Amino acid sequence: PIVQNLQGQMVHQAISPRTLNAWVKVVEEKAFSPEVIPMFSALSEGATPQDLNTMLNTVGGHQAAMQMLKETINEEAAEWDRLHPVHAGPIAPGQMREPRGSDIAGTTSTLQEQIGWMTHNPPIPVGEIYKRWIILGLNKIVRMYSP
C-alpha cells in the first residue's frame, strides 16, 4: 500500500503477512457472505491495484465466482476505456500519461507508475475506481450466490 511516512510524505510499504492471512481466513470462513464487502473495504485501505490483483490471485477455491469477477473487472475496464477516450496529440515531457482500464486493473501499469498517479498533484483515485468494480462484481456474486 501507499502510506504516509513520519517525515510527512506518501511512500509505498508492503502489506503485512497476518493482514494477508486475515484476508485468506475471511474468505475461508464467510465465503460469499455480505460481511466480506466492508471487511474487504477496511483491509483495502490505501491499497494499490497491484495489491488488489495479489489479493484476487491468492484466492483458492470458488473458481466459478473468481472467473465471473475477472470477467466483470474486464467489462468495467472496457467501459472505462469507452467512457474516457485517449487524449489529444502526443504525451507532454512535463507530464505523465493518462491511465486506461488495464492501468486501473494494474495490468499495464508498473508500481512506480501507480505511485506517480496517486501521489502526484492532483492525484487520481485508480484504487477507488477498481474498488467500485470489485464491490459491483461482489454484488453480482452475492446476488447469484443467494439460494
Binding site: Q63, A64, Q67
Partner: protein, 74 residues
C-alpha cells in the same frame, strides 16, 4: 488430470462442475483466445444431457450468471 477429462456427472450440479472447470482452466497456461475457445466449447460439450438441453435453449451470447441460474433445478 487433463481439461478434456473434466465432465459433469449425471446427478452432479452444474455449479460444482463449473467450479471444477475454472480450477483446471486455472492450471492451463494457453493463450487467452484458446482459453475463450475452451470456455464456449468444452464446458457445454461435457455438460450432462439434462442441462445440456437447457443450455442449448439459452442460445449464444449467454453469460455465466445466466448459465448458472439456468441449470439450477437440474
Amino acid at each position: 488430470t487433463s481439461i478434456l477429462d473434466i465432465r459433469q456427472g449425471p446427478k452432479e450440479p452444474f455449479r460444482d462442475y463449473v467450479d471444477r472447470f475454472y480450477k483446471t482452466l486455472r492450471a492451463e497456461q494457453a493463450s487467452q483466445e484458446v482459453k475463450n475457445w475452451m470456455t464456449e466449447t468444452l464446458l457445454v460439450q461435457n455438460a450432462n444431457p439434462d442441462c445440456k438441453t437447457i443450455l442449448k435453449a439459452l442460445g449464444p451470447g449467454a453469460t455465466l450468471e445466466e448459465m448458472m441460474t439456468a441449470c439450477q433445478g437440474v
